[PDB]
Design goal:
The complex is a heterodimer of chains A (about 550) and B (about 400). By secondary structure, chain A is of the alpha+beta class. Chain A has five domains: about 120 residues, HIV Type 1 Reverse Transcriptase, subunit A, domain 1 (HIV Type 1 Reverse Transcriptase, Chain A, domain 1, Roll); about 90 residues, Reverse transcriptase/Diguanylate cyclase domain (Alpha-Beta Plaits, 2-Layer Sandwich); about 90 residues, 2-Layer Sandwich (Alpha-Beta Plaits), CATH 3.30.70; about 110 residues, Alpha-Beta Plaits (2-Layer Sandwich); about 130 residues, 2-Layer Sandwich (Nucleotidyltransferase, domain 5), CATH 3.30.420. In chain A, about 30% of the residues lie in helices and about 20% in strands. In chain A, helix 10 runs parallel beside helix 12. Chain B is α+β, with helices and mostly antiparallel strands. Chain B is elongated, with a radius of gyration of 25 Å. The chains are: A alpha+beta (about 550), B alpha+beta (about 400). The structure holds the ligand N#C/C=C/c1cc(Cl)cc(Oc2ccc(Cl)cc2OCCn2ccc(=O)[nH]c2=O)c1. The ligand N#C/C=C/c1cc(Cl)cc(Oc2ccc(Cl)cc2OCCn2ccc(=O)[nH]c2=O)c1 binds next to strand 4, strand 7, strand 8 and strand 9 of chain A.
């Protein structure tokens, strides 16, 4: 008998202030009992468990479904704390790839001997007329908190020397499986696979699927990858949870499939946490899911990664805070695709969203390929220059080039840095009464132009915006506007091209039509002339 | 050669912090470095029974193409017991900031001599990540004293005193301060004599960044001096004075605001009345005085605000309570940063943190004029410092921007 190489156990402790679990044993049928005895006998013969006695106060419950089901839930609570799936698009193209699933994974790894006593369980005897049979685990149990971690670390320790000795092959370790790629010849490859599993056999790990592999919701073929078929349920009556499932599946589909839109279906999920409900879809949402079905009509595939070629990311504006992207090496062959939705906010602009999307793609790419891709962006170099140079916040985009594929991200308006000569000066103000919600908004100018509009159901901030809006309406192509509102100045200096407030939107629409606009601020109630709080206080 | 027992603060478990994604080259550098440190016994591989993790990445220091290993110890540092010693909380050498020149040296290599308390080692655990999660990350822990941890200089304080004892009794006029892995040395000497003395000291360390705090002073609030004033000029002036009236007691804008009477075009010149000129003058006199009752509270957090002024110019204010300024400054420095905002900001944050270390002996909490996602993505690329400060993000544009330019 050639001795199998010893696997050093991992020291395990419970949480401080706790002693090993004590829980009773539920009544089981004679069938289940006999089955469990049958299993435990040969398990003891194999050395996976050992018989114990009254000296062990600790007990965990066990059922049978034959398959022995051990419940470690309380031990899981009592066990200490122990220390992302690989994306197919990141996997490098290899001439040969072999999958190996270790047989009896956890049972091939010895448990810490001092921790074994806490793994105890009791098989109830027939008619409860005798003390139930006592057992404990000598190896890593199924359902234990610390089994996957210990098993994985053990596997790594065992695998390490073989990898260094075989640099011409590459080994990936996920959970219970190994995936070995190589560019060698199929003969040499198979040979090194046999060598690998023999090397594993030295430590007593048993190894036996052929392409295409169905793995973690993916289909991995030799030259390409895609996802597994997506099932979108057709229902005339939907629910909340169903929209959760739907949005989940669509998000999953959007990695390979371009053009997936989850927004309209996502808007229905605000104010959720109710499992059941019936919600209608807007024509926007109906046509959204329909267009999604149209995209899912025919299969799309991604390719694998080649380190010798550049990594390229291209972004399109999809409209309504939606952005889509493709990551690829050579034209028309995508590594993968994706999407970005704008953050929740009152005001926004395209440039900011594009920036955010770029950050997202950058982080994801760094995860997957370990590098930042070169970007193709639907924005002119000059636009980006003007933007980042005049923007109050610090901002940056990694190396990128302009691709002309409308709609192009643009700057819709630009405020002047200095007062304009020859332009009419509009001193604006607005105010409201908190109790009656009655207010006024208007302006007076240097040419004598004046206006005051009364308003119902309004607030100070709304009238402050309204005043500026009025100044924009009644003025020429070049205008100087003076305001005391820090709120309005704060909104406009953020440079939104879109807002959820219609008043702000209209202001933007006015700014777009202007040649030159200079927006100046003054303190309120300082006796500054032309700024009339008295006209709007009446 | 003998480990000193160290624990955490009461009711605090060791740090568990997610390791952020790293680029391939940085992962390579970290692998090589950590292998070298493993062969030197400085670190050792650990098993799954260690739940704790602290982030790690790789940088490149000034004038060096060699990758350095940077651990981010902030969480461990705040979870590490507040370190008081037999030194009784050594008071900050306030003479350091008053020095003609201060040189910063990296003494971190010395920390690898002293072994770390065996019980505490598990809290120093970190992970070298793998690309695309293809393999489990490589886990280590520090056997010796790790660089970046706050307990390291404290533990090494006695030894360092024993090492620097001859130098301090030789030329007592040289002030020495120690923060983290960095050793700051003040001198009134000449840059040549300064550099030779620095080589002398570094070789003195061997057998066992040039700063000029004298050129860094405090700056006042100044108002324009014009022969002719437009309506816009006076509006801005009034706004700035109204803002400054929060800082200074006797600022009065009424006679200046009086000039703004009626509705005039912004670019129209308004002659100043005698009363308005007098008011402006009195305001200047008020602005020339220092600020009333401004003191440094060691028990309070330092707060740094930064504004982007454009054209590579940045302004900053270090304070404890609003409108009481402990320090103010403007970083215009241009090195290689011309087209990159985030790089400029990163360098600025580093400089401000350094000056904070020199003046108060501790780092402030930054409020950064940048979106969280952008900064969090790019900041580790431009970071050459061995320490890291705390920061937050201001997404509403400040009006005070042009009041600091
Ligand atoms: N189940 C399961 C497998 C799952 C699985 C999971 C992972 Cl993380 C990797 C894997 O295979 C690979 C293993 C090692 C390398 Cl260097 C590349 C691979 O390329 C993958 C690309 N590829 C994929 C299949 C094929 O035939 N040829 C090929 O080059 C397989």
């Amino acid at each position: 008998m050639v001795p199998i190489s010893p696997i050093e156990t991992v020291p395990v402790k419970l949480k401080p202030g706790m002693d090993g679990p004590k829980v009773k044993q539920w009544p089981l049928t004679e069938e289940k009992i006999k089955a469990l005895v049958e299993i435990c006998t040969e398990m003891e013969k194999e050395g996976k468990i050992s018989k114990i006695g009254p000296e062990n106060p600790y007990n965990t419950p066990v059922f049978a479904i034959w398959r022995k089901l051990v419940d470690f839930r309380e031990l899981n609570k009592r066990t200490q704390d122990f220390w992302g799936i690989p994306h197919p698009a990141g996997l490098k193209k290899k001439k040969s790839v072999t999958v190996l699933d270790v047989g009896d994974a956890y049972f091939s790894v010895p448990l810490d001997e001092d921790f074994r006593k806490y793994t105890a369980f009791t098989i109830p005897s027939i008619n409860n007329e005798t003390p139930g049979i006592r057992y404990q685990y000598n190896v890593l149990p199924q359902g234990w908190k610390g089994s996957p971690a210990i098993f994985q670390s053990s596997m790594t320790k065992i695998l390490e020397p073989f990898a260094a000795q075989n640099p011409d092959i590459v080994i990936c370790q996920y959970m219970d499986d190994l995936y070995v790629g190589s560019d060698l010849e199929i003969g040499q490859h198979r040979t090194k696979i046999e060598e690998l599993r023999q090397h594993l056999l030295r430590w007593g790990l048993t190894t036996p699927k052929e392409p295409p592999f169905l793995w973690m919701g993916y289909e991995l073929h030799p030259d390409k990858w895609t996802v597994q078929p997506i099932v979108l349920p057709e229902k005339d009556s939907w629910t909340v949870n169903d929209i959760q499932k739907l949005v989940g599946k669509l998000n999953w589909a959007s990695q390979i499939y371009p053009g997936i839109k989850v927004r309209q279906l996502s808007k229905l999920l605000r104010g959720t946490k109710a499992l059941t409900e019936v919600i209608p879809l807007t024509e926007e949402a109906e046509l959204e899911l329909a267009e999604n079905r149209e995209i899912l009509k025919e299969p799309v595939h991604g390719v694998y990664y080649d380190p010798s070629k550049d990594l390229i990311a291209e972004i399109q504006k999809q409209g309504q805070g939606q952005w889509t992207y493709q990551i690829y090496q050579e034209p028309f062959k995508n590594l993968k695709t994706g999407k970005y939705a704008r953050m929740r906010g009152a005001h926004t602009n395209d440039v900011k969203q594009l920036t955010e999307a770029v950050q997202k793609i950058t982080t994801e790419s760094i995860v997957i390929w370990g590098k930042t891709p070169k970007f193709k962006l639907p924005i002119q170099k000059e636009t980006w220059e003007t933007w980042w140079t005049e923007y109050w916040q610090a901002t940056w985009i990694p190396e990128w080039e302009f691709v002309n594929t409308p709609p192009l991200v643009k700057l819709w308006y630009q405020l002047e840095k200095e007062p304009i000569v020859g332009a009419e000066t509009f001193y604006v103000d607005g105010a409201a009464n908190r109790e009656t919600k009655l207010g006024k908004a208007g302006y007076v100018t240097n040419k004598g132009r004046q206006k005051v509009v009364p308003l119902t159901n309004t607030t100070n901030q709304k009238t402050e915006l309204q005043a500026i809006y009025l100044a924009l309406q009644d003025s020429g192509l070049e205008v100087n506007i003076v305001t005391d509102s820090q709120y309005a100045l704060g909104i406009i200096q953020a440079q939104p091209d879109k807002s959820e407030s219609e008043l702000v939107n209209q202001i933007i629409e006015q700014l777009i039509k202007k040649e030159k606009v200079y927006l100046a601020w003054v303190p309120a109630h300082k006796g500054i002339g032309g700024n009339e709080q008295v006209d709007k206080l009446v | 050669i003998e480990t000193v027992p160290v624990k955490l603060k009461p009711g605090m478990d060791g740090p568990k912090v997610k390791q952020w994604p790293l680029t391939e080259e940085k992962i390579k550098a970290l692998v090589e470095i950590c292998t070298e440190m493993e062969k030197e016994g400085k670190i050792s591989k650990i098993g799954p029974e260690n739940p704790y993790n602290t982030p790690v990445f790789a940088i490149k220091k000034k004038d060096s193409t060699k990758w350095r290993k940077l651990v981010d110890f902030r969480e461990l540092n705040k979870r590490t017991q507040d370190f008081w010693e037999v030194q009784l909380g050594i008071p900050h050498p306030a003479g350091l900031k008053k020095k003609k020149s201060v040189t910063v040296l990296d003494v971190g290599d010395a920390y690898f001599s002293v072994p770390l308390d065996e019980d505490f080692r598990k809290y120093t655990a970190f992970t070298i990540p793998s690309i695309n999660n293809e393999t489990p990350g490589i886990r280590y822990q520090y056997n010796v004293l790790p660089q970046g941890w706050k307990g390291s200089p404290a533990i090494f304080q006695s030894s360092m005193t024993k090492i620097l004892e001859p130098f301090k009794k030789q030329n007592p006029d040289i002030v020495i301060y120690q923060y983290m892995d960095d050793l700051y040395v003040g001198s009134d000497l000449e840059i040549g004599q300064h550099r030779t003395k620095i080589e002398e000291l570094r070789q003195h360390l061997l057998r066992w960044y040039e700063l000029h705090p004298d050129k860094w002073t405090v700056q006042p609030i100044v108002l324009p001096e014009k022969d002719s004033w437009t309506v816009n000029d006076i509006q801005k002036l009034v706004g700035k004075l109204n803002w400054a009236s929060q800082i200074y007691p006797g600022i009065k804008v009424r006679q200046l605001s009086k000039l703004l009477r009626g509705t005039k075009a912004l670019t129209e010149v308004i002659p100043l009345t005698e009363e308005a000129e007098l008011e402006l003058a009195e305001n200047r006199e008020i602005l020339k005085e220092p600020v009333h009752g401004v003191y440094y509270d060691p028990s309070k957090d330092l707060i740094a605000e930064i504004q982007k002024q454009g054209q590579g110019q940045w302004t900053y204010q270090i304070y404890q309570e609003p409108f009481k300024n402990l320090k103010t400054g403007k970083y215009a420095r241009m090195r290689g940063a011309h087209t990159n905002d985030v790089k400029q900001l990163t360098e600025a944050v580093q400089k401000i943190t350094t000056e904070s270390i020199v003046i108060w002996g501790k780092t402030p909490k930054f409020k950064l004029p940048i979106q969280k996602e952008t900064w969090e993505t790019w900041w580790t690329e431009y970071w050459q410092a061995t320490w890291i400060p705390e920061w937050e993000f201001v997404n509403t544009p400040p009006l005070v921007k042009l009041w600091y330019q």
